Design a protein around this ligand. Structure first.
Ligand SMILES: CCCCCCCCCCCCCCCCCC(=O)OC[C@H](COP(=O)(O)OCCN)OC(=O)CCCCCCCCCCCCCCCCC
Ligand SMILES: CCCCCCCCCCCCCCCCCC(=O)OC[C@H](COP(=O)(O)OCCN)OC(=O)CCCCCCCCCCCCCCCCC
Ligand SMILES: CCCCCCCCCCCCCCCCCC(=O)OC[C@H](COP(=O)(O)OCCN)OC(=O)CCCCCCCCCCCCCCCCC
Ligand SMILES: CCCCCCCCCCCCCCCCCC(=O)OC[C@H](COP(=O)(O)OCCN)OC(=O)CCCCCCCCCCCCCCCCC
Ligand SMILES: CCCCCCCCCCCCCCCCCCCC
Ligand SMILES: CCCCCCCCCCCCCCCCCCCC
Ligand SMILES: CCCCCCCCCCCCCCCCCCCC
Lengths: 504, 111, 478, 55
């Protein structure tokens, strides 16, 4: 019931930020803040009223809330939303990151701020719709709908220091990758729908009805291959990964647009929700390839991030390595590894949000991003280097932050399933510590090798410090007490794991 | 001055967590906090890059050691199903009555 | 077969547009008035569009040994009439700057619309040929309407020579087909063959020659080289009409011919058409990568979109929604090309002499023309298959049709061509918003037309059910 | 050895192939009407030969 409002409130809010620019340039930021606060409040109200902690696993489908409306009755297409523990967790994370993104661009008084805010809210609404839709056409619709505002934000409101041609090139590369992968996913969806139509005679796109689809061996492999191409481009999984550092480099200066659409794990959610229950045997056979791809992605992202002279590209390849960890977790078939994957995804979103916000604030202070131009910044900034030290400590898998709980439950489940990939991924954790230390010592420690890093810099504002400390508090509380997050998503993970291991 | 005293206080707290924990995961929390405080205190004079390189080498070698400790933790949880020390010394000889290879590997990575 | 009053009321748009042609000619002969002649033309086209409702009341039947009226004819007649009305609306501000006579433009547009309606109603080889030439010759006039300009004269010469050659090819193909069969009806092209000898060599060669002619007329590879030059040289309302109405009418009559002829089931023709569609998609997408001219880029876009249409055409004998997919795609492509070429025409209007260039300069269009830039980027996203657009709904229909018939090579071609089209369409849509250094209600009418087209594309991309129901309601005769 | 992202270049290779193929295919659009008629006759020969072979 509240899910259509959960999707439409960002869209109506973005339309309001566009329309209320005539009353002032400082108005659409307040409107966007109000509507993301309303979205987050609705998500938290769904969390409180759901009773997710006391919910027990009953098998797919099992939704805490469900909405149906016919959209295209010729193909049996419905605007069909459904929320359970995992989807609610991702919706809450999306709302929190949207509030952080709206706050992160609070000092932009540009003449066209209203369209920027509409663009951001439409990205957030598309991400929420991806997390909520259980109709194949609607899920694909939101999946490709959240990319046009992404493209326009990167291309027009991107990094002003870089040339326009590089911004358009990076945005076009990102759009081409994501939309071609979405098209392949659509072809897999259509072939699955047609297989179900020949087997049954009923036109439908519903996830619940397409679950019991009798398919031969080889067709199911192709369908899961298309789904995995989409969910591996947007994860990212190597070699389908260059769009992520190219778009992070040319992202807008404040870093809000990084948090809005690039930083939310829609692809791994789709792997958990759509790839494994619909195609269990084919995913079971593709598990070694995906797990070795995750190992190669971890080490490729580590060696990439160590060799990066750009901070934003370093955080992008950190995201690549941690998403490789999640990809290893997803194809294990273990409840403990799945719960660790959920915790790791939430904690990695929080840590990368803190890292990108601190990098944006640092670029506001110093107007450069090259590691050969900073050094010894601890003595010049009041708050930024210690908070960045905390967040780089979080991204190396340090206990006390939720990332450690994430990768360690992932590796416990993986060692229960596959030990060699577990031990190689732990060496990947060593590599993660290596590049985090390299970034810390190239950025804030040492002696200054530039003139702009030889002067005293102004301290951070109250709102940026407040939101970064909020991220710090959330990461620490997730590291020390991850139990409410674990009990929130216990039923959905249980249903997915039981459906995966009971149909092989 | 305050940075030094905060780092040493966190070192003391993490070592107390290490020596007071009843399970291997909480002791790993204290273990890695001790390693982090060692890194933050070795490179205290951050202006000299040699101190930073020393802190790098210290944290990388200790992180390799902590990865071996994690190997032992994974093996022990996969075998006995628990991470409590008393539960190890209770239901280890019953489980390892037939085979002792996995316990040998667990003790090797503990070493 | 004679003509009944029911056959006459089923002939309403043809008779109405012909009477409009006669009335417009008599008005020109009385006194040359641009406004009055354009008003008479648009009133006649609107009268045909609203007499389509009376035709729908009259039912579906066969009106001639040549023509057949059903929902197929309704839908394609409506699309052709809408394209012609938009062409006149865009043509008036362009013709306001014309020093020479302006009233012949609407006469040619009306005659070409008559040819399009005949092609929509065509159930005969004679009617198909006559509709093709009745579309072609007014397009010969309209492409070289500004014959003083070198580009328009060159495009007129190229189009006239190549279309005469393709008409000769098509007529020789019909001659071979008629020599094989003995009847010129669409349903009888292959009824004299049975027990597995449908692949008669003379019938196959004749159908291949008409395939050559129609592939010229539909900008299909390798008869596609005329498309960017003729699109660029011709006036922008002429480019609008040639992109929408001619392609729609010729593809509708090709749909009806391949549906009704028993030889359309033959595998050799289907494989040849699959190769043609594959090459058309790949070539029309690859050749628009580095185009700084909007007209040539839209010509290669037309080539690729007709390749997608042919991909939907191949599965006509296997699937059940293939002609429904073609109808939905053609409606979306009509609205997309109408919006794009209308923005091009409104920037190119009035005609600023033949010696001056008609350069578009789309860079930074938002900073003086925000509504037209918004319409142009909406139609650019619509042509790419990007969602919440009608072009995406058509692309989804084409993909489902290709998935049903196991035509996976064509589906991979659609995916690759969609990626390349994404590149150049997004390049144009983002070049609209970079930085670079009217006054009458006809221009406002053209802007209203392109704005309504953009809003229709957005609404029917978000909510495509009414268009799907309308296209499914346009059920031809089995 | 890996600072230049070799897998990114490996996956960017099809973009270079597409650009080269488009540049090669644009040479047929030379603007000569006699070449257009010759290409139309070439396509007629190809279509008729394909129909005769596959019959
Ligand atoms: C797991 C593998 C199998 C499944 C694959 C599924 C498909 C999705 C994932 C792969 C996508 C690969 C996309 C590669 C190109 C990315 C776009 C790009 O880089 O565009 C920028 C580039 C222009 O930039 P610049 O370098 O400045 O050009 C100089 C010219 N002025 O633009 C250009 O140079 C021209 C761009 C043209 C359009 C893009 C290329 C389309 C090619 C076909 C895509 C379909 C997939 C085919 C197989 C891919 C390889 C396996
Ligand atoms: C312009 C030039 C540049 C741009 C264009 C570049 C090329 C674009 C086109 C690329 C794709 C080519 C075609 C790929 C699909 C091939 C399908 C195939 O071979 O199917 C055969 C068989 C079908 O199954 P069958 O046995 O008939 O089932 C019935 C009874 N079992 O299939 C099977 O039995 C299953 C076969 C599975 C393996 C084949 C598919 C490989 C996919 C490769 C990409 C993904 C690899 C994994 C992920 C990588 C990291 C993301
Ligand atoms: C012998 C039996 C037991 C073996 C156990 C496993 C191996 C243990 C290895 C222990 C020794 C590690 C030494 C690490 C030193 C790190 C400090 C260092 O050298 O720093 C220099 C450099 C500084 O970085 P930068 O930011 O560029 O500096 C700014 C300017 N000064 O920083 C660098 O150059 C970065 C150095 C990174 C080192 C990464 C090490 C990874 C170890 C992986 C172990 C894998 C084991 C299995 C291998 C396969 C076996 C089949
Ligand atoms: C570059 C991107 C685009 C790439 C090209 C486009 C996709 C190419 C897909 C190639 C598929 C090859 C299939 C080969 C065998 C075909 C014949 C066959 O076995 O048909 C079986 C079946 C029809 O017989 P039926 O009675 O329905 O039997 C039910 C069996 N389950 O058949 C059916 O019911 C339908 C079978 C459909 C199979 C899935 C097709 C789409 C799969 C997703 C995309 C391709 C794989 C992922 C990407 C790879 C790299 C690009
Ligand atoms: C999806 C966003 C997650 C943000 C991080 C949340 C981490 C969990 C924090 C839970 C609260 C911990 C402190 C209070 C415990 C109260 C326990 C009451 C019942 C015994
Ligand atoms: C996804 C389908 C299409 C949705 C609408 C896309 C946008 C259409 C045009 C709306 C107006 C755009 C205005 C952009 C202003 C940019 C100003 C930049 C200043 C630096
Ligand atoms: C450039 C476009 C390439 C598309 C390749 C599509 C390959 C499809 C293979 C289908 C095989 C079917 C076998 C039965």
């Amino acid at each position: 019931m509240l899910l259509p409002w959960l999707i439409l409130i960002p869209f109506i809010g973005g339309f309001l930020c566009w329309q209320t620019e005539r009353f002032g340039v400082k108005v659409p930021r307040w409107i966007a803040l109000i509507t993301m606060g309303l979205t987050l409040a609705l998500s938290l109200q769904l969390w409180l009223q759901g009773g997710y902690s006391l919910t027990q696993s009953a098998g797919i489908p099992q939704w805490q809330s469900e909405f149906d409306m016919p959209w295209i009755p010729r193909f049996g297409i419905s605007i069909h939303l459904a929320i359970d523990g995992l989807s609610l967790l991702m919706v809450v994370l999306t709302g929190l990151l949207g509030v952080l993104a709206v706050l992160c661009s609070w000092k932009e008084i540009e003449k066209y701020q209203g369209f920027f805010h509409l663009n951001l809210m439409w990205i957030l609404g598309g991400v929420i719709g991806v997390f909520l839709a259980i109709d194949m056409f609607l899920f694909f619709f939101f999946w490709e709908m959240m990319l046009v505002p992404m493209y326009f934000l990167i291309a027009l409101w991107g990094h002003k220091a870089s040339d326009g041609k590089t911004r358009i090139t990076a945005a076009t590369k990102f759009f081409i990758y994501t939309q071609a992968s979405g098209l392949v996913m659509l072809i897999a969806i259509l072939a699955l729908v047609f297989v179900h139509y020949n087997a049954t005679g009923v036109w439908t796109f519903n996830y619940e009805e397409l679950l019991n689809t009798p398919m031969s061996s080889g067709v199911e492999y192709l369908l899961m291959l298309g789904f995995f191409i989409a969910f591996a481009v947007k994860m990212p999984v190597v070699p389908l990964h260059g769009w992520l550092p190219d778009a992070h480099s040319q992202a807008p200066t404040a870093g809000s647009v990084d948090l809005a659409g690039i930083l939310l794990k829609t692809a791994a959610y789709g792997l958990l929700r759509f790839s494994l229950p619909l195609f269990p045997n084919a995913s079971a056979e593709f598990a070694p390839i995906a797990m070795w791809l995750g190992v190669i992605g971890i080490f490729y992202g580590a060696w990439m991030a160590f060799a990066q002279t750009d901070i934003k590209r370093l955080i992008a390849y950190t995201s690549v390595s941690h998403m490789g960890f999640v990809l290893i977790a997803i194809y294990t078939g273990s409840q403990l590894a799945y719960q660790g994957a959920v915790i790791q995804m939430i904690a990695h979103g929080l840590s990368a949000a803190g890292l990108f916000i601190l990098c944006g604030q640092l670029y506001e202070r110093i107007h450069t991003r090259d590691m050969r131009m900073m050094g010894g910044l601890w003595s010049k900034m009041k708050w930024l280097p210690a908070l960045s030290l905390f967040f780089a400590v979080a991204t190396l898998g340090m206990p006390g932050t939720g990332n450690f709980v994430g990768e360690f439950m992932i590796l416990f489940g993986s060692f229960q399933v596959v030990p060699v990939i577990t031990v190689i991924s732990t060496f990947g954790l060593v590599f993660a510590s290596v590049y985090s230390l390299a970034m810390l010592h190239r950025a804030y420690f040492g002696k200054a090798k530039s003139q702009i890093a030889s002067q005293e810099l102004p301290g951070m504002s109250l709102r940026e410090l407040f939101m970064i400390l909020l991220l710090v508090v959330l990461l620490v509380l997730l590291g020390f007490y991850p139990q409410p997050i674990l009990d929130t998503s216990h039923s959905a993970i249980g249903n997915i794991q039981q459906w995966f291991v009971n149909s092989v | 001055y305050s940075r030094f005293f905060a780092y040493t206080n966190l070192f003391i707290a993490s070592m107390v967590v290490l020596v007071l924990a009843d399970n291997l995961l909480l002791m790993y929390l204290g273990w890695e906090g001790v390693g982090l405080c060692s890194y933050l205190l070795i490179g205290f004079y951050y202006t000299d890059p040699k101190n930073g390189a020393a802190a790098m080498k210290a944290f990388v070698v200790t992180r390799v050691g902590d990865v071996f400790l994690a190997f032992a933790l994974f093996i022990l949880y996969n075998e006995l199903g628990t991470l409590n020390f008393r539960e190890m010394v209770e239901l280890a000889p019953a489980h390892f009555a037939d085979g002792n290879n996995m316990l040998m590997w667990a003790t090797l990575m503990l070493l | 077969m004679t003509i009944t009053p029911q056959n006459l009321i089923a002939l309403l748009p043809l008779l109405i547009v012909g009477l409009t042609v006669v009335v417009v000619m008599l008005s020109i002969a009385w006194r040359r008035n641009h406004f009055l002649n354009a008003t008479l033309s648009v009133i006649g086209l609107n009268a045909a569009l609203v007499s389509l409702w009376f035709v729908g009341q009259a039912g579906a039947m066969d009106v001639t040994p040549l023509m057949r009226v059903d929902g197929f004819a309704m839908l394609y007649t409506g699309l052709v009439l809408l394209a012609s009305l938009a062409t006149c609306t865009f043509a008036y501000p362009w013709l306001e700057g014309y020093n020479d006579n302006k009233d012949e433009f609407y006469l040619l547009v009306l005659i070409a619309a008559l040819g399009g309606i005949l092609l929509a109603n065509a159930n005969h080889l004679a009617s198909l040929f006559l509709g093709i030439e009745l579309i072609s010759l007014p397009l010969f006039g309209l492409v070289g309407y500004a014959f003083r300009q070198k580009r328009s004269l060159e495009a007129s010469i190229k189009y006239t020579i190549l279309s005469a050659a393709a008409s000769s090819f098509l007529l020789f193909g019909m001659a071979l087909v008629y020599a094989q069969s003995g009847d010129l009806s669409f349903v009888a092209l292959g009824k004299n063959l049975g027990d597995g000898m449908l692949n008669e060599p003379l019938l196959l060669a004749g159908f291949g020659l008409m395939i050559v002619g129609l592939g010229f007329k539909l900008s299909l590879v390798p008869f596609h080289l005329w498309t960017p030059d003729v699109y660029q040289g011709a006036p922008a309302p002429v480019s609008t009409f040639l992109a929408t109405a001619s392609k729609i009418a010729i593809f509708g009559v090709v749909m009806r011919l391949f549906l009704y002829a028993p030889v359309g089931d033959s595998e050799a023709i289907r494989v040849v058409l699959a190769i043609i569609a594959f090459a058309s998609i790949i070539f029309g997408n690859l050749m628009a990568l580095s185009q700084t001219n909007i007209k040539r880029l839209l010509g290669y876009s037309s080539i690729s979109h007709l390749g997608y249409l042919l991909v939907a055409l191949i599965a006509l004998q296997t699937g059940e929604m293939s002609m429904e997919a073609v109808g939905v795609y053609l409606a979306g492509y009509l609205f997309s090309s109408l919006g794009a070429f209308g923005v091009v025409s409104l920037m190119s209007s009035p005609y600023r002499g033949p010696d001056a260039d008609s350069l578009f300069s789309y860079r930074g269009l938002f900073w003086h023309r925000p509504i037209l830039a918004a319409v142009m980027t909406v139609m650019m996203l619509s042509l790419a298959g990007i969602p919440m657009t009608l072009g995406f709904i058509g692309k989804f229909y084409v993909l489902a049709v290709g998935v049903q018939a196991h035509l996976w090579w064509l589906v991979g071609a659609v995916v690759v061509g969609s990626a390349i089209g994404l590149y150049y369409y997004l390049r144009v849509a983002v070049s609209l918003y970079l930085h670079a250094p009217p006054s009458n209600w006809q221009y406002s009418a053209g802007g209203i037309v392109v704005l309504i087209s953009a809003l229709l594309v957005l609404v029917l991309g978000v909510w495509p059910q009414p268009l799907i129901s309308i296209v499914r309601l346009a059920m031809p005769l089995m | 050895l890996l600072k230049r992202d070799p897998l990114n270049s490996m996956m960017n290779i099809p973009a270079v192939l597409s650009r080269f193929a488009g540049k090669g295919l644009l040479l047929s659009e030379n603007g000569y009407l006699r070449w257009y008629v010759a290409s139309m006759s070439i396509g007629a020969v190809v279509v008729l030969a394909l129909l005769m072979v596959l019959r």
